[PDB]
Symmetry: C4
Subunit: 274 residues, 4 copies
C-alpha cells in the first residue's frame, strides 16, 4: 500500500525543508520544524509503524498535549538531505495519555534523537492552541540573513522594529498587525529559552531570536513559510536603503491608520503611537 | 481529445509564473497577471467548459470589454502552486455582451474567485486598447525588489525618475522611451487607486506604486516579461552605483538625443531637458 | 540518422545560453553567440540542409573568412528560448568564396536574421586568427552586471581599469595577461563601433564598453565562458569592497612580477607601470 | 555487477561538487576534492580497474599515508561537467608500499592527472590524521566569494579573524572553536605553499589563503561542506552590516565565555583575550 513518505503530511515537510535551504536560511543543521497532526491522519498508515516505540522522559509535562501525534526534524540532520533520505531525518512522536513523556513511533533511525529545540517547541505549541482556539499547528525557526543583520544595527525593541518593518512594505501591516517579538540574547539548548519564547507567544506571532533567527506560528505549513517570507522580503528592502544613504520619504502615520480600517485589522497601539 | 490544459495559452502562463517565482518578486500570493484571448483560440475545447457558469457582476460598467474572453489567476493563490495544479489556480472568464458581468467557463474550481485587484486590471486593459489599437494584451504587477527601494531615495517626480533610469543602462531609452509615471501612495484594493493607475497608463507603459510595486503592459506574454526584467536590471545597477559612494561620469544629454535619433524613438521632453 | 540538432556543436550551444540565463547577464534579448566550424563537421548532416539557401550580402569584404561555416544566434530571440526551439533561434551559414556574402543553409526559420552585431562579430574573428595562428574560434558578448556598474565610478582608460582587475583575485593575471580595452562611449549597432572593437581585439582578448557590456573570445566554449566568468567574479569583489570604505591593502607591484615569472606570462607594460 | 559510477563514494563526489557550482564558488577550474577510502571500499570494483597503472613519483616521501587509496579530481577540470561525466573528471589513486609515488587505477582518461595541488593535499592529509587519530577523511578547497573580500579589509590574523567570525553567528564558535588559519600571500602550485598550509593544520581545521580562497578538512563530506559554509554565512552577515555603517551590538565576551562550557567546548584562548 502507499508508502508513508508519499502522504500529504510528509510531502509538506519535504517542500518547506527544501525551499528554505535554497534561500540560504538553513546553513548546516540550523532550522527545525514541528507540525501538529491529527489521529485520523495516521490511522490508515499503521502498517509502517515500528514494533518498539522508544520512551524518552519529557522534562515537564504538558497535559494539553496528551495523546497528540507530531512530526519533527532529527537533531543534527540536514534540511537539503531530507529529500534524499526522509526516514533517517524525520520522525513521528506521540505523547502518552498522562503527558509526562513521548513515544517515538516512526523514523529517527540509527538511534537518532529528536531535535534539541523540542522543549521550546512543545511549551510554545500549547500556548498558541488556547490563544487562537486551537488553530495554530506549526512553529518555525530558520537563519534568515537579512533579519539577523538588522539586529546588529537597530535596537532590539518591539516598538521600534514593528514600525520599521511596517514601513518597508504595504502588505506587512496586514500580515503581522500583532507585531514582532524580540528577546535579549540567551544561551540556547536549555529549558529557560522555552519559557521566554512560550511567554511571548501570547501577544505576538513572530518573535526574533537575537543573532540566531526567528520564530513563527501558523495553521498550515505553507502560510508559516509565507509568513516568515513576507517579513524577510521587507527585510531586504530595508537593508538596501540604509546602505544607500538613509530613508528619505515613507508612509505617514495617517496613511498607516487608513490601511488598518480598510482591511479590518487593529494595528498595535504601542508601535502606532511612535 | 487533447485537454485544454495542453494548449498553448495554458502552458504559456505556467512559464510566466514560475520564472517570476525564482526571481524573488512574488513571495506569498502578491502580484497578478492576466492575458487576453480570442474566441477562436478556445473554440474546440468546449469539453472542459463548466456546465453551469457562475455569474459575478462588475463593480463598474466596462463597455469596451463586452463579449471578450480572458484568462486570470485566483485570489489568495500562490504563483508557485500553479504548475502543480493548472485547473485549481487559473481560470478563463468571458464578459457578457453588456459589460456588467462575466461567466466562469473553465478552471477556478472549489469556489475560487479572481484576484481582488480585478478592477485595476480591467480598467487598464480597456484604456491600453485605445493607445495601442489592440496590440497590447497583457497587464502585469509584481513587487520588483530594486524598484521598490528606489522610491525611498529618489523624488517621486516623472522628470527626475525617468532620467535616472535612462542613465543606468544604454538600452533603457529604447525599451521604454515614454518614461515611467509615478502615483501618490494609496490604500490598495479600493476603486480610487484604479482610476489613478489607469490615468497614468495613457502616457506611460510603466507605472510605479510607491512602496508597493510596479505595473507594466506588453504585446505578448514574453515581451511584458522582458519589459519588467529590463527595468529591474537598470535599477539594480543604479543601486550598487549609488551605494558605492556616488556617480562621477555619465551619458551626456548630447549622447542621449543621438542614441534616440538612431533608433527612431522620441524621448520625453520634460525629463530630457533636465 | 540523428537530425542535426543532435550534433556536438548544437548541444554545446544550448549549454552556453542556458547557463548564462541563470547567471543573469541576458535579460530580454541581450547577448550574442557565434561559433566557427569546419566543412568536415557538417558533412554527414547534408539531408537537413534547406533547399533554398538565402543569400545576404556582407557590409564590407572579408577575404580571410572565405569558405568558412558558422553557427549563429538569430536576432530578436530570447536566450531562455534557445533550449526550447533550436531551429527557430539558431542556424548555420557559410561565407562565400569571395568574401562578400553568406548563404543561410539551415535554421533562422520564418524570415529570421542573424544578430545585428554580426559586423562586430565577423571583424573581430578576422583580427584574432592573425594574432593566434588559427586557434580562437568563439566570440561571446554579455552584459556582465558587476562590470557595468564599474564604468560609472572608474576612469575610462585602458591602464587603470586593467590594473584594478588584476588585484581582484590571483588567477585574474594568469588568465588575461594582456589586459582589457575600454572604448569611449559610442552608439551601438553601427560599423563605426565595430572597427574600434576590432582594433582593440589585436592586443587583448577582453573588451569593455562603458555603461553597456563586455566582449570576449577564446578557443572553445568552455574556455570562452571561463574567461568571462573569471572576469566578472573579480568585479564582484571590488564593488562589494568599494562600498565598505575603499581598498586598504592589496597586492604590491613587485608581487605580480614574481607571479608572472612563475607561470611564464608577460604582463602588459602600460598597466604594470602604474 | 553494479557500475563504479553508482558507488557511494562516487555519488558523494557528484553531490559535493554540484552543490559548489550552484553556490557560485568554483568559477572556471577552481576547486578540488580528495577523500580517503579503504581497500574494502574498492574491493568490489576490481573489474573496472585499469590493466596498466601508470606510476607517477611523489615529490616527497609520505610514509604515514602508505597503502592508503584516495579519490581525486583532475587538474584543469570544470566543476560544472563533473556530473556530466564523472569518469573523465574524477580518478582513483593508491600509494605504493614505500610511499614514494602513486598508481592510477580508474578514471583520469586521456592522459589526465590529479589536481595540481596534490602535494598540498598529502602534506596536510598526513598531519590531520595525527592530530585527530585518523578521523579526518576529506580535504576541500573552493573560492567562496564573500570570504575573500573580508581579507581585503580586515587584518590578516588568525585570532582577529576568528574573533569576528564568532560574533557573526551563535553556531560558529561551537563548529570551529579551534579558529581558522591565515597565511601570507604566496605563489600556488609549489611545495613551499604545501609546507606552510600543512604546518598550520596542526592547530586549526581551516586555513584562509589571502585573495585566493579557503582550505577545508573534516571527518566526512557532509560535515566538510558545512564546515566552511558556516563561515560563509557569517561573512554574508558581516558583509551586510559593514556596508550599513558598522556593527552596533553583538555577542559580548561575557556572553561567549559561558556559551562554550554549556556545550563543554574548549575555545581558542588567543581570541578570547581580545
Ligand atoms: O589596388 C586595389 O585595391 C585597387 O585599388 C584601387 O581601387 C580603389 C577604387 O578605384 C575606389 O573607387 C575605391 O573602391 C571602392 C568602390 O568604388 C566601391 O564601390 C566599393 O567596392 C565594392 C564593389 O562595388 C563591389 O562590387 C565589391 O567588389 C567586388 C567585385 O565586384 C568583384 O568582382 C571582386 O573584385 C575582383 C576584381 O573583379 C578583380 O579584377 C581583381 O581586382 C583587381 C583589379 O582588377 C585591379 O585593377 C586592382 O584594383 C585596384 C583598382 O584598380 C584601384 O583603382 O587590384 C584588384 C585586386 O587584385 O580582384 C578583385 C577581388 O577578387 O571582388 C570585389 C570585392 O573584393 O568583393 O565589393 C567592393 C567592396 O565593398 O568599395 C571600394 C573600396 O572602398 O577604393 C579602391 C581602393 O583604393
Ligand atoms: Zn501589490
Ligand atoms: Zn549589448
Ligand atoms: Zn584556489
Amino acid at each position: 500500500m502507499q508508502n508513508i513518505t508519499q502522504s500529504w503530511f510528509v510531502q509538506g515537510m519535504i517542500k518547506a525543508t527544501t525551499d528554505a535551504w535554497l534561500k540560504g536560511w538553513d546553513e548546516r543543521n540550523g532550522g527545525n520544524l514541528t507540525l501538529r497532526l491529527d489521529d485520523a491522519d495516521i490511522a490508515p498508515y499503521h502498517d509502517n509503524f515500528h514494533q518498539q516505540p522508544r520512551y524518552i522522559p519529557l522534562s515537564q509535562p504538558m497535559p494539553l498535549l496528551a495523546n497528540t501525534p507530531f512530526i519533527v526534524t532529527g537533531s543534527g540532520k540536514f534540511f537539503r538531505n531530507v529529500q534524499l533520505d526522509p526516514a533517517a531525518n524525520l520522525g513521528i512522536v506521540k505523547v502518552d495519555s498522562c503527558g509526562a513523556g513521548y513515544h517515538i513511533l516512526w523514523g529517527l533511525t540509527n538511534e537518532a534523537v529528536p531535535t534539541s529545540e523540542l522543549p521550546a517547541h512543545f511549551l510554545s505549541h500549547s500556548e498558541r492552541i488556547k490563544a487562537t482556539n486551537g488553530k495554530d499547528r506549526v512553529i518555525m525557526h530558520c537563519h534568515a540573513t537579512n533579519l539577523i543583520a538588522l539586529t546588529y544595527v537597530l535596537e532590539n525593541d518591539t516598538a521600534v522594529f514593528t514600525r520599521q518593518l511596517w514601513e518597508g512594505s504595504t502588505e506587512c501591516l496586514v500580515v503581522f498587525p500583532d507585531g514582532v517579538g524580540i528577546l535579549p540574547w540567551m544561551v540556547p539548548g536549555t529549558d529557560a529559552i522555552g519559557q521566554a519564547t512560550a511567554q511571548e507567544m501570547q501577544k505576538h506571532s513572530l518573535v526574533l531570536w537575537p543573532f540566531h533567527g526567528v520564530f513563527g506560528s501558523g495553521p498550515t505549513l505553507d502560510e508559516t513559510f509565507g509568513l516568515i517570507d513576507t517579513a524577510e522580503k521587507s527585510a531586504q528592502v530595508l537593508v538596501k536603503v540604509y546602505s544607500m544613504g538613509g530613508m528619505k520619504q515613507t508612509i505617514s502615520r495617517e496613511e498607516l491608520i487608513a490601511l488598518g480600517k480598510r482591511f479590518g485589522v487593529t494595528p498595535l497601539a504601542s508601535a502606532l503611537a511612535l
